[PDB]
RNA sequence: UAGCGGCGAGCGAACGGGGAGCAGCCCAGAGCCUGAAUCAGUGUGUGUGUUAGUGGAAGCGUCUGGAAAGGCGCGCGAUACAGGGUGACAGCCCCGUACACAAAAAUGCACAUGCUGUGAGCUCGAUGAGUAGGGCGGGACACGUGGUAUCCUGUCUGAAUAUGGGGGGACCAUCCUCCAAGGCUAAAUACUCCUGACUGACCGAUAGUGAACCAGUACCGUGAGGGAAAGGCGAAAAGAACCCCGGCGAGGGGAGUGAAAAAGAACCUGAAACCGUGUACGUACAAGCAGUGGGAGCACGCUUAGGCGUGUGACUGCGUACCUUUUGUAUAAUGGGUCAGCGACUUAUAUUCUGUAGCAAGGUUAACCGAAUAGGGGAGCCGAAGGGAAACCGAGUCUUAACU
RNA sequence: GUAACGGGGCUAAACCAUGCACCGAAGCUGCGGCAGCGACGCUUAUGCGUUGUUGGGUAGGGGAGCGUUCUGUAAGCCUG
RNA sequence: GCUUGACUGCGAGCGUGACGGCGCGAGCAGGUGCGAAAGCAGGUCAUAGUGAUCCGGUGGUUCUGAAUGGAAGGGCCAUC
């Protein structure tokens, strides 16, 4: 299907904001530890007006509007998500960045064997997806930075973009096309 | 391709940053103007405050009541009446086709949209043209 | 925090089809004998909310 | 995130003080005073770019009137003579001529006389 | 939402539904057979976790450089390319990380077991009285005495016992349901003084706790209490032997370490205010927001060698700072001694409007389950039909006996 | 402290009436450029050729940008 | 002299107020009075003679009635 750039943009921004966690806070003039004493009398002196050491205008005060642990989780519509994935795979095919084979596994947990197989396939920064998940296949590409191995259910459009080519199990293609419908 | 994305133009709007310079237009006072209760920290009237003058929600009479019966009646169009899982229309199966709801005890079959299929209708109140439409497809009034 | 309802406005008003609200006339609970039947017959039905007041009703909802 | 202001503030202050080199005292040294005098210098610049034209035109007219009275005529009758002789030479060039080559100016005066009478 | 309310401001349910967790029992009592499940105490074994730990892969050469992890050429390991440190940026130098293992001793927990207690199951019957109600006064139920159900009672009273009692929002009748005036109950729920591991579009010495540093210290106050400031030599002290001046000083010039001393202990970088020294130009008959415009002279830097460039500014036209509040300010109305740092329309959930994206008479889920942004879950909300206070009707509805 | 033309100063440099010149502002025109709004054709406001027009501005409304910190692109690029 | 039009339900349209409101009104249906009839009468020749809402009083009621039938209450119409 033709490419909907603004839709895909909205979806990937939502996914990154979902990756973001809300761990920050500061202290207000309620939470700065101190006293409610007026530092000096309202009148009599030639100094400024004074009410509390805790105000942000004073040194060692609060922040004027302190931060709270806020959830950045956006809401993604299911049809918008699925249309973004349909468009993103169609654009992968149009960029010729997608290869489909029947079988892709190796029967030993060795990154040496995996790297030799990727050299034999002429592959550098790729994305592996499976029908069902193999022990040794996942173990052989955990330690490889440019390669992620996943189940066909656990997909994200951001890693569908980020890796230079995507290779797919044919059973995974069947599961994806069933899962999109 | 990840660094090649711009959204739809005019979707992300810039936003107002007040009190941060003359050339913005929102320099001194930032859209709030000079002195006044409106020119204060949380200086705000309530809803419908017309000064001391007695407002429109307060100088008029209050009237009416709530039936506690209309809230548990509802209304049924003609298009829906086809999603009743088979072709019978009851207090049930509309409740189970999720058009009316659980607490509903009474119902009416108002003419709205084309009706297509023969439908047996059981135990409702039925309007004039919609009765004739249900009979035009082949249905029948039945208590 | 959902918006609190102005309950007086909810009692004195109800919404029509094209977004207008309806209201009931004043001058109808007491003194009526020195008034005219023509005036009270004008006052007895309900009417629509005027132009400048819709903000001060919708804010109350 | 928290943003600090030192580098950009130093850049703006340094730019204004660069524009305010050669001023007297706090006018050269202090932002709160230099920032005023640079804006006032902008005002006076915006004014005097106009006022150059008035001041140079009255300089030119002074020199033309002087040389015309040397050659025996007034400025008013001289300009009227040029307009009736259909002469479109302006006061900049006439002033430069009346300084350098007197005889050309004298001939222009004689043409204005012949166009006048 | 329905309700409460000087029916003002504000307070704000219940029914019913969708989910995590689900678990039931004993006394007011005597017989009959009697440890028969339960838990409570005491131990044993097993599993698993805590309190120390063990092993743990594979790199060289050249070049710049004070120093190699960097550059170039060639290799190897990887269930470890998480992270940290080593003279700059390291998978292969070190500690670790993935994986694989470990307990004489005290423990947490979960099973099974043995020892002591209590009590299983069946018949017959027993079914919590100054209590339920009621008058006065207050409080809670979202419900301010309101027509106000229901609970609690400080004072005064005061029933019935399965043919009986209570509730169904004043109350009466019918009907429906329940059995109060005795007790126990795991889980799912709320919190982090403390311990381990990990994450951060959180901060980076005026920030972040008050405190990166001998902080609740110095200091103020009788006391309660208040309450700061102050981080960085260098990679390694190799922290400056020795000579000279000076007062056996403080401080300095050489030597010297070092890549660097203008990194010499006030120590990385070293801005600005402020204060000096040197050079160039102007100023000692000339008045005022000190500039701007024109412009003579002087001194340097360029050359196509005409003068374009900089520094200075004799003389001259014009010319009363900025903010704020104002009808209006040079105003003698306010504010500012100056620099540097900090400092003021943000946040969450609702509503509406615009723009944009999706879907489309449909749109969309929330809480929850979940190899946890996927997918289930459509309980619910909004919209397509309104009118009328309402029963009620419906492309019509309301008023009216009735409308063209 | 002159102090009742701004001054010097004037028997016209004052006053009444007439004519022709001239000066005089950021107004008007000439040149060169920027932007907005139209109106035009190739073509789709991507633009190009004109041509008309507008462009003082507080509170205030709208539209478009720069610069700083942090995250992804970034085991990539620059750097003893 | 005769009489109850100082009747009811409506209102094309207009005016005047920011708004609540206030005022003028031909004409329709019913049903009256006066005149023989054409016709007139929705109070006074007009412009002032007034009080919002809430709260509660009284009368009427094709409304509602917290399990059902009633009732208390709430609404609507008239009015204090
Ligand atoms: Mg105090
Ligand atoms: Mg601090
Ligand atoms: Mg602070
Ligand atoms: Mg403005
Ligand atoms: Mg102000
Ligand atoms: Mg004012
Ligand atoms: Mg104001
Ligand atoms: Mg539903
Ligand atoms: Mg409308
Ligand atoms: Mg009334
Ligand atoms: Mg300087
Ligand atoms: Mg070891
Ligand atoms: Mg190792
Ligand atoms: Mg270094
Ligand atoms: Mg009992
Ligand atoms: Mg009582
Ligand atoms: Mg610092
Ligand atoms: Mg010494
Ligand atoms: Mg120092
Ligand atoms: Mg230093
Ligand atoms: Mg002199
Ligand atoms: Mg002057
Ligand atoms: Mg200011
Ligand atoms: Mg003042
Ligand atoms: Mg003003
Ligand atoms: Mg002035
Ligand atoms: Mg002064
Ligand atoms: Mg002043
Ligand atoms: Mg002052
Ligand atoms: Mg400053
Ligand atoms: Mg979901
Ligand atoms: Mg002229
Ligand atoms: Mg001019
Ligand atoms: Mg002009
Ligand atoms: Mg032009
Ligand atoms: Mg403008
Ligand atoms: Mg009644
Ligand atoms: Mg009830």
C29 vs B48, B56, B61: nearest CB = B61
- Secondary structure class of D5 (helix, strand, coil): coil
- Secondary structure class of A103 (helix, strand, coil): coil
Q: Write down the domain spans for chain B.
A: 1-143
Q: How many residues does chain D have?
A: 117
* Contact predicate D23/D31, CB 8 Å: no
Distance, in Å, from the CA atom of B51 to the CA atom of B31, rounded to the nearest integer, reads 23
* Contact predicate A104/A125, CB 8 Å: no
Residues in B closer than 8 angstroms to C9, CB to CB, are 48, 57
How many Å lie between the alpha carbon of B119 and the closest alpha carbon of chain A?
33
**Structure token digits, residue A77:** 């519509």
In the 13-72 stretch of chain B, whose C-beta falls under 7 Å of nucleic acid strand G? Answer: 50, 53-54, 56, 58-65, 67-69
Strand G nucleotides, any atom under 7 Å from protein beta carbons: they are: 6-11, 18-25, 42-43, 49-56, 64-66, 74-80
Which nucleotide is closest, CA of B60 to its C1'?
A: G53
- Secondary structure class of B88 (helix, strand, coil): strand
Instruction: Outline where chain D has alpha helix (H).
Output: 6-19, 26-29, 31-70, 75-84, 91-100, 102-116
Q: Write down the domain spans for chain D.
A: 1-117
Backbone dihedral angles phi then psi of residue A60, each to the nearest 5 degrees? 55, 35
- Secondary structure class of A149 (helix, strand, coil): strand
* Contact predicate A29/A56, CB 8 Å: yes
Q: In terms of C-beta density within 10 A (0-12 exposed, 13-18 middle, 19 or more buried), how is residue A124 classed?
A: exposed
> Which chains are within 8 Å of A by 3+ CB pairs?
B
CA angle, residues A43, A49, A52, in degrees to nearest 5:
115
Nucleic strand E under 7 Å from the C-beta of B127: yes
Residue C2: DSSP 8-state: P
Resolution in A: 3.9
* Contact predicate A163/A127, CB 8 Å: yes
Strand F nucleotides, any atom under 7 Å from protein beta carbons: they are: 20-26, 59-65, 67-75
Backbone dihedral angles phi then psi of residue A165, each to the nearest 5 degrees? -135, 155
Distance, in Å, from the CA atom of C28 to the CA atom of C8, rounded to the nearest integer, reads 18
Distance, in Å, from the CA atom of D95 to the CA atom of D56, rounded to the nearest integer, reads 10
Strand partners, C23: C47
Contact B60 C26 (CB under 8 A): yes
């Amino acid at each position: 299907r033709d490419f909907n750039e603004a839709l895909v943009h909205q979806v990937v921004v939502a996914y990154a904001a979902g990756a973001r966690q809300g761990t920050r806070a500061q202290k207000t003039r309620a939470e700065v530890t101190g006293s409610g004493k007026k530092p000096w009398r309202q009148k009599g002196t030639g100094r400024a007006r004074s009410g509390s050491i805790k105000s942000p205008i004073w040194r060692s005060g609060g922040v004027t509007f302190a931060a709270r642990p806020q959830d950045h989780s956006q809401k993604v519509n299911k049809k918008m998500y699925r249309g973004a994935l349909k468009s993103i795979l169609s654009e992968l095919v149009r960029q010729d960045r997608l290869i489909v084979v029947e079988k892709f596994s190796v029967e030993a947990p060795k990154t040496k064997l995996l790297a030799q197989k990727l050299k034999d396939m002429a592959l550098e920064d790729v994305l592996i997806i499976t029908g069902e998940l193999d022990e040794n296949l996942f173990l052989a590409a955990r330690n490889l930075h440019k390669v992620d191995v996943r189940d066909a259910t656990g997909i994200d459009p951001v890693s569908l973009i980020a890796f230079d080519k995507v290779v797919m199990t044919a059973d995974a293609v069947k599961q994806v096309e069933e899962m999109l419908a | 391709r990840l660094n090649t994305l711009s959204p739809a133009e005019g979707s992300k709007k810039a936003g107002k940053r007040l009190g941060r310079g003359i050339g913005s237009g929102l320099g001194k006072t930032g859209g709030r103007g000079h002195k006044g209760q409106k020119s204060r920290s949380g200086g705000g009237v309530r809803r419908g405050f017309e000064g001391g003058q007695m407002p429109l929600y307060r100088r008029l009479p209050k009237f009416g009541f709530t039936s506690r019966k209309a809230a548990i009646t509802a209304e049924i169009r003609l298009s829906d009446l086809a999603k009743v899982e088979g072709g019978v229309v009851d207090l049930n199966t509309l409740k189970a086709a999720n058009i009316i709801g659980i607490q509903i005890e009474f119902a009416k079959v108002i003419l709205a949209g084309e009706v297509t299929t023969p439908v047996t209708v059981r135990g409702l109140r039925v309007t004039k043209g919609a009765r004739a439409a249900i009979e035009a497809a082949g249905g029948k009034i039945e208590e | 925090p959902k918006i609190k309802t102005v309950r007086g406005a909810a009692k004195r008003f109800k919404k029509t089809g094209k977004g207008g609200f309806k209201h009931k006339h004043a001058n109808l609970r007491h003194i009526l004998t020195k008034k005219a039947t023509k005036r009270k017959r004008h006052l007895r039905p309900k009417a629509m909310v005027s132009k400048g007041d819709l903000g001060l009703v919708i804010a109350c909802l | 995130a928290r943003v600090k202001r030192g580098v950009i503030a130093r850049a703006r202050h340094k730019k204004i003080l660069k524009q305010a080199k050669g001023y007297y005292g706090a006018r050269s040294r202090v932002y709160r005073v230099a920032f005023q005098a640079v804006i006032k210098a902008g005002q006076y610049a915006y004014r005097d770019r106009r006022q150059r034209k008035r001041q140079f035109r009255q300089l030119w007219i002074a020199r033309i009137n002087a040389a015309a009275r040397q050659n025996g005529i007034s400025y008013s009758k001289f300009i009227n003579g040029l307009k009736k002789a259909s002469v479109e030479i302006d006061r900049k060039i006439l002033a430069d001529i009346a300084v350098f080559d007197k005889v050309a100016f004298t001939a222009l005066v004689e043409k204005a006389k012949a166009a006048l009478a």
